[PDB]
Design a protein around this nucleic acid. Structure first.
Ligand SMILES: [Mg+2]
Ligand SMILES: [Zn+2]
Ligand SMILES: [Zn+2]
Ligand SMILES: [Zn+2]
Lengths: 49, 66, 51, 204, 113, 137, 49, 263, 339, 97, 133
RNA sequence: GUCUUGGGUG
């Protein structure tokens, strides 16, 4: 998997079509996924677990 | 467990002061005055010594297994 | 053993030894066997007599 | 050793994971050179109303300066004003604010920072116990679909609501590829006359 | 298991140059420099040194990601001056200032004895 | 030996279950037994209680913080928090790395976590003296 | 097993926030980037890479 | 034009006012002394017999955190730039620790003074654990009971604090400027009055407070910097300051070298 | 904070901020002030982020085009003329800047707008700073007097309603019992008490109050949060009603029988800063427990409802002739949305 | 006038009442009295009321589609198995629900 | 080489909302009904009530990428104390002879009333404002 | 490698 590969990214529950979105890949150190902070609203996500 | 060598926040060496701190507490000096005399001035260094819990005494009571 | 169904489950549990307070709390726990089959929110409610 | 993604909390419901780590010289410092072990965001206090968190930071600062332990038993006659009086008598801004400097530039920060000790906890949820990936692996005997479990090298469930979202997106090819080529795809022979899978195929 | 090495911050690989210069064609007489294996310590020093020259019209730097140990610097100069030359001039000036500072500190420390 | 049971048997402390509690009049603090004659903009207003002419108290709480349990007793100043956060801490403190026992080195369990350098808290409740939280932080 | 099922070529981990990522970018750990794969047909435009 | 004014000078700390230098220079010096001044610290531990209650890597972390005398560490080579396959004296100092409770009563404390230097690139004055006095016992390392033993051979190497905090010669570099906020670089939060509610800087009496008739000055930059370097005994305060200056000079010389040799 | 009217930036921070913008064209904007010292305003640096060809106009409470409060918004060719930039401009509401850039410039430029604004504002805030402390929840003495006076007035009003109900003088309401009328009137009084005390507390807050800045930006918290932290937690509700008589004729065994006062039936007079009493603590715990039960228990009904809706509507598609038909080919709408 | 209980047909007749504007919150009554198009209108009004109670705004076309599916056969089709599974669609769809 | 020269008498100065900025009102001393409302930086050009300001509006400072000024060149701003650059965003050719011009100095706003014969040439894209005393 | 039970996480 390499930079700019399109991947489907998803958080449950998937209540609407914007809970599943396609992202470009950027490969990074350490064990967590990284999100720009403006997309945490459609995913309804935060960073506490 | 046992007194940490350094202060977490800044890195001052506090591992050589636990025995002097206990002796100062024995002769009646209150904790703030003892920490003052050991020349721990930043509250990070002070809470290193003031909040330490020495558990090695409890671990040493179980017989050597060799 | 042959009547495992129709018997109360979870009456005995593996003691939680992750940390000390978790053990102290597990030893003082209580269970109302209402079950999750049923949406009656009344027995789930903090009550005056709980004081 | 703590790293990005490990879970920490204070005793007031304020849980969170590590986003990044900075070295000593990159962190903001007070005029005494004190740097924080930990920087939490101000936007977690107002709507959660964890005032005890701030009060406990203030009490802990005073206790560490004066060398005792603050009493935070509920329903006592202690007040924030007395704690601030003690703190100001110790030569610090009475509300726990301090003038801090930017680690990158040494320039003062235009705003003052609420600063002091707080008791944090190391929770059992570490990222390295959760990170899982699977390209191909063991399947179930009955269904021939990926097994369940991080420990068993399983796969993730693409459930019904995920299918609803894919359908809403109109991505039919992706749905067919998830459910067939990323899972239990098989090839069977049917009878063109009776339409039952009772055909005996010898391919060699 | 995904943690990079703590010495990749400063140890330059053999396939990675220390310094790389490209020109900004949009504006005249401007260049973009990427410094590998450095951080704010050199960047801010150089930036505030260069910002005080009369012949330097634009100078700035950024560290695009804290998890990667490099920074990029944009520097423009007037028609006669070359941004590269201003960069050596700034380096030499800071070197001289540090040398004078060291001499005076050593003398002061000796006097305190 | 003069302990708790001697207090209970000398008639200065008694036990009440929920049904007997219906019939009793409990003073909240030992000071509530007498009406005070204040004006502290900082200390919280102890409730007015103006409707009743003369109170006939039968019991007093030993201390109001005793209504909390083991996990809620770790929280500092829980009366300054909204209650869901106190519940979340009651859940999360059971997941907090510490020293579960002092003989963890002669025990063989499926999993065990020990903090290198446990520290007692700088802000502490009176109840943790009985919970050993300062002995095994 | 038919309306929804477990699938290959997927990953999961804790999410983190990154002010320096673009809106349609996701930061992917190196270990996951190496565990997952994409099959790329060899052509006379991608043979060196 | 740069000037130094030492205010207090003992072995562990130096308090000085820096003047006629840019703020970027002073902050770069603070950062360099915190992060890029080489020292010596135990980087490799070999356990022979450890029957104490403490774990092997717990003790190894503690041993790595022990300050060692680093006066001559600059005449030494980084262990990644030495052409030896296994370790050698050009780039390492070898220490031994042997501790053992004799008898069957009391606790035996294992201190950092018990570390013994065996080899090392003599006659360089590196390697010894730092003692405060002639009678110092050093840092507490472990405790031993009946028949419990500790036998450890540590290797010490040259490194900087970027790689790991154990190579930092400094604990805390206090640093401030403009005690009276004449430059208005901060903007004070207050409830009633910002002058009463905020404590004075400890160098307030070193500068004239602003007069009530004064107007704001838009030409003044920061020009005087009060900083207090403290050390862990591995280096002396004047040594830390001078080697921070030299390290900054050589970083600038590296940049200059690459620039000139890119022509 | 950056687009406030009295926010000015010197040349060096301006240069760094400009270089931080990925789509900056390399042209340094003229400073708003040229003499005696070049100063840029935060509105200029934010306008750098916005693409050109963007026009936005909003009126807030009938502000003039000279905007004494700096409210409303005017954007001309991507440049801010006046108006603080807050949730009403860069939030997810309709008609704002994000919607405008999406509709005029496309999805790609709108995606890059998020990054440009994030980078500029994050750098400026990194070098400015923003915090919150225990002092941001503390109101001065005069406001405390006002708040406590309002709460005492409401307690007297409730006592008067109670007297009127007990001496048979209360005015009933249509479709409502005498007891339900009494409870509705008391709840009205106490809700307005909390709202008035909160208004006083909000008015006491300076523009440097950090809670006030967060609320005004619209990034976290609201007026109810300020009210509960600084002035009054107010009345707790369990199942739409006040605290029920769980014991025989009382809520707790520390009250007397048939005491209908606000304190007996779950009114919390203190703030979070001041601390709740044990009785108020227990009542607030009951209310929070009700909320937790609702969150835990309603999600199953909601998920079932959404599953049933999805199964009912899953086979419906717009066809090439414009009709909306199901899988049987039957018409559901002759034109989708009728437009 | 607002009321407890429902009798649309008899109240619509009472003199003094605007017989062309009496409305019921039970759209089954509307269907029995006024027909299926009035039922669609009432259904949209109820759904819009429930959604827009708290200031939420759902675009018209979604609720229009939902009420058109519920009134397409001439009678009220509930969103249940008793409504969905009495359609004429394939067996596999119905079994999958 | 200037568009509108005039002298104004400051009437009121409000700080109120801000510490660093104040709004001033001033009528022309020679031609009343010419009103001027202007936001100014206090720390760069402090202004008191009843003070007298020579106010100029110009389309240039001469006699596209901003660079710091040298000492050796000269411009119109050399004779003034407070120079600002702004954007004309509204030219209100309104009632009988009330003409209002609106200029935004990076969010610091200005309004200028008066007869058409004074502000006719103030219908520009961008305006400099210069002030003395 | 399978089934139940229990403790949890978002
Ligand atoms: Mg979450
Ligand atoms: Zn410290
Ligand atoms: Zn057949
Ligand atoms: Zn070697």
């Amino acid at each position: 998997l390499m930079d700019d590969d399109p991947v489907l990214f998803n958080r449950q529950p998937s209540l609407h079509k914007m809970s599943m979105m396609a992202h470009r890949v950027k490969v990074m150190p350490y064990s967590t996924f990284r999100l720009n902070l403006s997309v945490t609203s459609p995913y309804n996500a935060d960073f506490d677990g | 467990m046992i007194i940490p060598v350094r202060c977490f926040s800044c890195g001052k060496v506090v591992g050589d002061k636990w025995d002097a701190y206990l002796r100062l507490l024995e002769e009646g000096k209150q904790e703030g005055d003892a920490l003052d005399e050991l020349k721990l001035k930043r509250y990070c260094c002070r809470r290193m010594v003031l909040t330490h819990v020495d558990l090695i005494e409890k671990f040493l009571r179980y017989n050597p297994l060799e | 053993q042959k009547k495992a169904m129709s018997s109360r489950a979870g009456v005995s549990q593996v003691l939680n030894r992750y940390t000390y307070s978790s053990t102290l709390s597990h030893l003082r726990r209580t269970n109302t066997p209402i079950g999750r089959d049923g949406k009656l929110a009344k027995p789930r409610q903090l009550h005056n007599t709980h004081w | 050793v703590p790293q990005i993604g490990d879970k920490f909390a204070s005793r007031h419901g304020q849980k969170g994971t590590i986003g990044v780590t900075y070295r000593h010289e990159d962190m903001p410092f007070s005029a005494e050179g004190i740097v924080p072990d930990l920087i939490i965001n101000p936007h977690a206090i107002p709507s959660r109303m964890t005032v005890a968190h701030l009060i406990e930071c203030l009490l802990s600062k005073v206790g560490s300066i004066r060398g005792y332990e603050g009493d935070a038993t509920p329903f006592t006659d202690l007040t924030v004003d007395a704690v601030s009086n003690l703190l100001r008598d110790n030569g610090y801004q009475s509300r726990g604010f301090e003038v801090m400097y930017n680690g990158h530039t040494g320039k003062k920060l235009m705003a003052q920072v609420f600063f002091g000790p707080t008791y944090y906890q190391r929770l059992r949820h570490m990222v390295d116990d959760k990170i899982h990936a699977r390209a191909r692996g063991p399947v179930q005997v009955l269904t021939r679909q990926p097994v369940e479990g991080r420990s068993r090298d399983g796969g993730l469930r693409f459930g019904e609501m995920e299918r609803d979202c894919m359908i809403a997106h109109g991505a039919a090819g992706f749905l067919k590829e998830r459910l067939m080529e990323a899972s239990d795809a098989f090839r069977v022979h049917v009878c063109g006359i009776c339409g039952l899978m009772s055909v005996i195929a010898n391919l060699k | 298991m995904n943690a990079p090495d703590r010495f990749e911050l400063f140890i330059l690989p053999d396939d990675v140059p220390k310094l790389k210069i490209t020109p900004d064609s949009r504006v005249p007489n401007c260049i973009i420099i990427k410094f590998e294996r450095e951080d704010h310590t050199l960047a801010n020093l150089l930036r505030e040194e260069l910002a005080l020259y009369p012949d330097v019209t634009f100078v700035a730097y950024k560290v695009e990601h804290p998890l990667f140990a490099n920074f990029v610097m944009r520097l423009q100069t007037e028609e006669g001056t070359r941004p590269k030359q201003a960069l050596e001039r700034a380096c030499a000036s800071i070197i001289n200032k540090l040398k004078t500072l060291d001499h005076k500190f050593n003398e002061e420390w000796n006097i305190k004895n | 030996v003069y302990g708790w049971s001697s207090l209970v048997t000398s008639g200065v402390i008694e036990y009440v279950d929920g049904e007997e509690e219906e019939t009793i009049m409990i003073a909240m603090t030992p000071e509530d037994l007498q009406t005070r004659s204040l004006n502290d903009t900082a200390k919280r207003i102890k409730p007015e209680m103006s409707t009743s002419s003369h109170h006939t108290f039968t019991h007093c709480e030993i201390h109001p913080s005793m209504i909390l349990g083991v996990a809620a007793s770790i929280i500092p100043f829980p009366d300054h928090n909204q209650s869901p956060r106190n519940t979340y801490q009651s859940a999360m403190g059971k997941q907090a790395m510490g020293v579960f026992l002092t003989n963890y080195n002669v025990r063989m369990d499926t999993m065990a976590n020990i903090l290198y350098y446990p520290q007692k808290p700088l802000a502490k409740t009176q109840a943790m003296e009985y919970l050993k939280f300062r002995e095994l932080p | 097993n038919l309306m929804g099922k477990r699938v290959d070529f997927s990953a999961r981990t804790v999410i983190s926030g990154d002010p320096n990522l673009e809106l349609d970018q996701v930061g992917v750990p190196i270990s996951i980037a190496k565990t997952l794969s994409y099959p790329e047909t060899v052509t006379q435009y991608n043979i060196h890479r | 034009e740069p000037k130094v004014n030492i205010i207090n000078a003992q072995d562990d700390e130096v308090e000085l006012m820096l003047s006629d230098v840019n703020l970027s220079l002073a902050n770069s010096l603070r950062r360099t002394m915190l992060a890029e001044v080489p020292t010596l610290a135990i980087d490799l531990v070999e356990i022979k017999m450890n029957t104490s209650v403490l774990a092997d890597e717990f003790i190894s972390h503690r041993l790595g955190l022990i300050p060692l005398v680093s006066e001559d560490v600059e005449e030494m080579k980084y262990s990644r730039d030495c052409t030896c396959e296994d370790y050698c004296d050009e780039c390492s100092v070898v220490l031994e620790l042997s501790a053992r409770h004799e008898g069957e009563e009391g606790t035996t404390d294992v201190y950092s003074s018990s570390l013994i230097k065996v080899s090392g690139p003599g006659n360089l004055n590196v390697g010894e654990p730092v003692r405060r006095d002639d009678y110092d016992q050093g840092i507490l390392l472990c405790k031993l009971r009946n028949h419990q033993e500790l036998n450890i051979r540590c290797i010490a190497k040259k490194g900087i604090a970027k790689e790991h905090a154990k190579w930092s010669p400094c604990s805390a570099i206090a640093f401030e400027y403009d005690p009276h906020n004449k430059l208005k670089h901060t903007d004070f939060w207050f409830e009633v009055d910002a002058k009463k509610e905020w404590p004075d800087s400890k160098y307030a009496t070193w500068e004239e407070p602003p007069k009530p008739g004064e107007v704001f000055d838009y030409k003044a930059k920061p020009n005087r910097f009060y900083m207090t370097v403290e050390t862990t005994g591995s280096l002396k305060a004047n040594q830390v300051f001078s080697r921070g200056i030299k390290t900054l000079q050589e970083k600038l010389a590296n940049v200059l070298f690459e620039l000139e040799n890119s022509r | 904070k950056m687009t406030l009217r009295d926010t000015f930036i010197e040349y060096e921070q301006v240069m760094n901020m400009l270089f931080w913008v990925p789509s900056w064209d390399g042209v340094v904007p003229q400073p708003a002030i040229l003499k005696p010292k070049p100063l840029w305003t935060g509105k200029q640096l934010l306008s750098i982020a916005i693409p050109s060809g963007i026009h936005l106009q909003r009126t807030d409470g009938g502000n003039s085009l000279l905007s004494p409060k700096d409210n409303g918004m005017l954007i001309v060719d991507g440049k801010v003329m006046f108006g603080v930039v807050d949730k009403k401009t860069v939030g997810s509401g309709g008609g704002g800047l994000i919607h405008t850039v999406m509709r005029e410039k496309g999805p790609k430029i709108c995606a890059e707008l998020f990054g440009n604004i994030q980078k500029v504002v994050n750098y400026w805030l990194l070098h400015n700073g923003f915090s919150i402390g225990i002092g941001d929840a503390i109101a001065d003495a005069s406001t405390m007097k006002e708040i406590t006076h309002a709460i005492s007035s409401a307690k007297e009003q409730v006592q008067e309603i109670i007297y009127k109900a007990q001496h048979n003088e209360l005015e009933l309401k249509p479709g409502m019992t005498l007891r339900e009328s009494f409870e509705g009137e008391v709840s009205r009084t106490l809700n307005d008490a909390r709202d008035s005390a909160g208004r006083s507390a909000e008015m006491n807050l300076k523009d440097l109050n950090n809670v006030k800045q967060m609320v005004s930006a619209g990034s976290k918290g609201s007026f109810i949060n300020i009210a509960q932290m600084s002035a009054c937690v107010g009345q707790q509700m369990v199942e739409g009603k006040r605290i029920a008589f769980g014991f025989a004729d009382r809520s707790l065994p520390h009250f007397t029988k048939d005491d209908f006062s606000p304190e007996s039936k779950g009114f919390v007079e203190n703030s979070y800063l001041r601390g709740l009493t044990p009785q108020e603590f227990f009542f607030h715990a009951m209310a929070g427990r009700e909320g937790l039960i609702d969150t835990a228990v309603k999600t199953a009904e909601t998920g079932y409802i959404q599953r049933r809706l999805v199964k009912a509507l899953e086979d419906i598609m717009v066809h090439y002739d414009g009709t909306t038909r199901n899988s049987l080919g039957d018409i559901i709408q002759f034109l989708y949305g009728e437009d | 006038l607002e009321t407890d209980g429902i009798n649309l047909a008899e109240v619509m007749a009472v003199p003094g009442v605007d017989s062309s504007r009496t409305y019921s919150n039970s759209f089954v009554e509307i269907l029995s009295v006024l027909g299926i198009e009035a039922t669609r209108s009432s259904l949209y009004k109820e759904i819009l009321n429930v959604i827009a109670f708290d200031g939420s705004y759902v675009n018209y076309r979604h609720m229009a589609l939902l009420v058109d599916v519920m009134t397409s056969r001439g009678y009220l089709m509930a969103i249940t198995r008793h409504g969905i599974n009495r359609a004429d669609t394939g067996a596999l769809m119905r079994c999958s629900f | 080489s200037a568009l509108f020269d005039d002298i104004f008498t400051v009437q009121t100065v409000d700080n109120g909302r801000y510490n660093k900025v104040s709004r001033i009102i001033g009528i022309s001393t020679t031609n009343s009904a010419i009103k001027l409302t202007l936001d100014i930086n206090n720390e760069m050009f402090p202004v008191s009530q009843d003070d007298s300001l020579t106010v100029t509006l110009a389309n240039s400072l001469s006699l596209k990428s901003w660079r710091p000024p040298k000492p050796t060149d000269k411009s119109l701003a050399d004779d003034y104390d407070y120079v600002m650059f702004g954007t004309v965003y509204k030219f209100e050719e309104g009632d009988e002879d009330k003409i209002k011009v609106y200029v935004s100095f990076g969010g610091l706003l200005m309004c200028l009333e008066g007869g058409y014969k004074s502000l006719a040439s103030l219908k520009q894209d961008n305006l400099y404002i210069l002030i003395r005393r």
